[PDB]
Design an enzyme around this catalytic site. Structure first.
Site, PDB file in Angstrom:
ATOM      1  N   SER A  40       0.777  -1.394  -0.123  1.00 31.21           N
ATOM      2  CA  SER A  40       0.002   0.163   0.067  1.00 31.21           C
ATOM      3  C   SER A  40       0.744   1.406  -0.110  1.00 31.21           C
ATOM      4  CB  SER A  40      -1.076  -0.067   1.086  1.00 31.21           C
ATOM      5  OG  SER A  40      -1.975  -0.755   0.957  1.00 31.21           O
ATOM      6  N   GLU A 136      -2.795  -6.428  -3.857  1.00 34.04           N
ATOM      7  CA  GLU A 136      -2.912  -7.356  -2.568  1.00 34.04           C
ATOM      8  C   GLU A 136      -3.927  -8.605  -2.799  1.00 34.04           C
ATOM      9  OE1 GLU A 136      -6.739  -4.477  -2.796  1.00 34.04           O
ATOM     10  OE2 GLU A 136      -4.430  -4.083  -3.047  1.00 34.04           O
ATOM     11  N   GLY A 204       2.265  -0.083   4.238  1.00 33.16           N
ATOM     12  CA  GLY A 204       1.738  -1.115   3.695  1.00 33.16           C
ATOM     13  C   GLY A 204       2.089  -2.742   4.189  1.00 33.16           C
TER      14      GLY A 204
HETATM   15  C1  PNM Z   1      -1.943  -2.393   1.520  1.00 33.46           C
HETATM   16  O1  PNM Z   1      -0.879  -2.318   1.875  1.00 33.46           O
HETATM   17  C2  PNM Z   1      -3.248  -2.966   2.328  1.00 33.46           C
HETATM   18  N1  PNM Z   1      -2.791  -4.368   2.423  1.00 33.46           N
HETATM   19  C3  PNM Z   1      -3.698  -5.273   2.091  1.00 33.46           C
HETATM   20  O2  PNM Z   1      -4.913  -5.001   1.805  1.00 33.46           O
HETATM   21  C4  PNM Z   1      -3.477  -6.774   2.525  1.00 33.46           C
HETATM   22  C5  PNM Z   1      -2.870  -7.094   3.867  1.00 33.46           C
HETATM   23  C6  PNM Z   1      -2.048  -8.175   4.049  1.00 33.46           C
HETATM   24  C7  PNM Z   1      -1.417  -8.601   5.083  1.00 33.46           C
HETATM   25  C8  PNM Z   1      -1.811  -7.771   6.286  1.00 33.46           C
HETATM   26  C9  PNM Z   1      -2.891  -6.936   6.379  1.00 33.46           C
HETATM   27  C10 PNM Z   1      -3.266  -6.705   4.954  1.00 33.46           C
HETATM   28  C11 PNM Z   1      -3.622  -2.069   3.149  1.00 33.46           C
HETATM   29  N2  PNM Z   1      -2.820  -1.311   3.985  1.00 33.46           N
HETATM   30  C12 PNM Z   1      -1.974  -1.776   5.265  1.00 33.46           C
HETATM   31  C13 PNM Z   1      -1.301  -0.910   5.768  1.00 33.46           C
HETATM   32  O3  PNM Z   1      -1.331   0.285   5.344  1.00 33.46           O
HETATM   33  O4  PNM Z   1      -0.581  -1.211   6.851  1.00 33.46           O
HETATM   34  C14 PNM Z   1      -3.448  -2.331   6.164  1.00 33.46           C
HETATM   35  C15 PNM Z   1      -2.975  -3.679   6.869  1.00 33.46           C
HETATM   36  C16 PNM Z   1      -4.021  -1.309   6.619  1.00 33.46           C
HETATM   37  S1  PNM Z   1      -4.354  -2.754   4.458  1.00 33.46           S
END
Ligand code: PNM
Length: 257
Positions: A40, A136, A204
């Site tokens: 992310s 993702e 992310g």
């Molecule tokens: C991008 O990084 C997003 N990640 C996901 O949707 C998948 C995922 C994989 C493993 C654990 C949790 C989620 C979103 N961005 C993160 C972030 O900003 O830390 C989230 C965990 C909020 S979801």
């Protein structure tokens, strides 16, 4: 150098670190050119490109969508399917809450991962490889380069948009405000930085225990630091630990002082 290896030792993970002190041009690199799924953190660059392609006025364009455009982690976008949301509100949601659907809507708007890559190549980022919408939703397996970047490239492209001339000042200001006001990063780069100091960050998280944060960090007095801390682990369903990021940030901060 051995502090970062100690952290890799303690957390059983691989770290990718690049930091630039824009006040001294001092650098702190550790596997700076090793690839990780950007996950992310790409949302920050996606908004940079949106901002380059739109007047601030045009961010008031409303985007409609249905429950079928929402998959996993949509804290903001799940509240507004009846009305849709403006590009401005989607940027806010994407950057400050890591709303996955908001990100997908913005990515569509800018022309998808192909157009994102085009624009990043245009700013001189040869490394960041956007490939998939939603990325993702699919695993980045070891050695795969789709949807990956490096600490050094992510820092470079983030500085380009946020701090240099890829954006005019009013748009650079919007990006910085959203990032400073991120809700998702308290236990990451922010937890490793001296108290008071302002932080703009984007987090992310993916499979293979991928745990990332990219940030601009301002000293009370003086020029900012731009930093990427990327992490991953051996196993597909590996857990991550935010503490690894916070502690790697501590080491960078040491090294910069
Ligand atoms: C991008 O990084 C997003 N990640 C996901 O949707 C998948 C995922 C994989 C493993 C654990 C949790 C989620 C979103 N961005 C993160 C972030 O900003 O830390 C989230 C965990 C909020 S979801």
């Amino acid at each position: 150098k051995d502090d970062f290896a100690k952290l890799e030792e303690q957390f059983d993970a691989k770290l990718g670190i690049f930091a630039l002190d824009t006040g001294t041009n001092r650098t702190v690199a550790y596997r700076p050119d090793e690839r990780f799924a950007f996950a992310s953190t790409i949302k920050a660059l996606t908004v940079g490109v949106l901002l380059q392609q739109k007047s601030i006025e045009d961010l008031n364009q409303r985007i409609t969508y249905t429950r079928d455009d929402l998959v996993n982690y949509n804290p903001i976008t799940e509240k507004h399917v009846d009305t849709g949301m403006t590009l401005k509100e989607l940027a806010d949601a994407s950057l400050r809450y890591s709303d996955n659907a908001a990100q997908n809507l913005i990515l569509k708007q800018i022309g998808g991962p192909e157009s994102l890559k085009k624009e990043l190549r245009k700013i001189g980022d040869e490394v960041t490889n956007p490939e998939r919408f939603c990325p993702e939703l699919n695993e980045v397996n070891p050695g795969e380069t789709q949807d990956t970047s490096t600490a050094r490239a992510l820092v470079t492209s983030l500085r380009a948009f946020a701090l240099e001339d890829k954006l005019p000042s009013e748009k650079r200001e919007l990006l910085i405000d959203w990032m400073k006001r991120n809700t998702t990063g308290d236990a990451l780069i922010r937890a490793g930085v001296p108290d008071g100091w302002e932080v703009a960050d984007k987090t992310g998280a993916a499979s293979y225990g991928t745990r990332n944060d990219i940030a601009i960090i301002w000293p009370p007095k003086g020029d900012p630091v731009v930093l990427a801390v990327l992490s991953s682990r051996d196993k597909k369903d590996a857990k991550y630990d935010d503490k690894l990021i916070a502690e790697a940030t501590k080491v960078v901060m040491k090294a910069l002082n």
